[PDB]
Amino acid sequence: ALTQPSSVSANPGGTVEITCSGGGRYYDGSYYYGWYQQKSPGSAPVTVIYENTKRPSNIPSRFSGSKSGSTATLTITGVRAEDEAVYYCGSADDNMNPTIFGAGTTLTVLGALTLDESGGGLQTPGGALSLVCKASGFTFSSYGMQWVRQAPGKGLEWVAGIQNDDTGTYYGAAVKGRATISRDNGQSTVRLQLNNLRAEDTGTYYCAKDASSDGGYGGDSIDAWGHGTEVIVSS
């Protein structure tokens, strides 16, 4: 599991730093982290920094990222009230678990592409579900894709990933043996099947696009998130 502080406080106009450690070493011997801002539980995260230092152009320039050795730091220079959020760090855990999220850092300040998920709703315990994410606004066949979920009031949890060419599928510990991810490049869709459903599978399921230039996926490199679809497992 990754390590990031539970909370940080800042005065408006201050400079704040949030660190993340514990990521797995990548194939190249280096370490890579991403930073995912979520302003309320159950809402689409927003990538503020990915691949250590890359900032999406719609994100304010007050956000920046750096990495030293195996530790990443998110810096907000001139923090604003609207920056209050939970910031989740993401990285690789190990070779068979390319995505893992830290527990989140809550920041207190003193005072295009579409990914559309369907198939959610009420599900019966012991049954199966099938979620579909329909992508538009980018060249789907070039990118790895992932599913991430969030139990009510809890943090982000990785569910599954798939490379652009169907290869390298892996699954989060809580769903391994029950889950299947697949994709259809011609339809620009990625699918999650999950069987033997249990109450613990209840939550918001987000489709996530990877930015890795090689069609891979990992915890450091998510650049777009859907608004998610709720799954409720109950009888």
CA quadruple 226, 98, 74, 49: dihedral, nearest 10: -40
Residue 193: CB atoms within 10 A of its CB come to 15
Domain ranges of the chain: 1-114, 115-225
H or E segment at 75? strand 71-77
**Determination technique used:** X-ray
| Contact criterion met (CB below 8 Å) for 76 and 19 | no
Asked whether the CA dihedral 205, 206, 207, 212 is positive or negative, the reply is negative
Residues followed by a gap in the chain, C→N > 2.5 Å: 111
Q: What are phi and psi of 187, to 5 degrees?
A: -100, -5
Q: Do domains 1-114 and 115-225 have the same CATH topology?
A: yes
Residue 36 carries which side chain, given as an amino acid letter?
Answer: Y
CA 31 from centre of chain: 17
Is domain 1-114 in CATH 2.60.40.10, yes or no? yes
Task: Give the CATH H-level superfamily of domain 115-225.
Answer: Immunoglobulins (2.60.40.10)
Residue 17 tokens, joined: 């730093």
Residue whose pair of structure tokens reads 């060419």 in the numeric block: 165
| Contact criterion met (CB below 8 Å) for 72 and 33 | yes
Those residues whose C-beta lies under 8 Å from the C-beta of residue 105, and which sit 6 or more positions away, are 4, 5, 6, 7, 8, 18, 86, 87, 88, 89
Is 114 in a helix, a strand, or coil? strand
Number of H-type helices and E-type strands within the chain:
0, 20
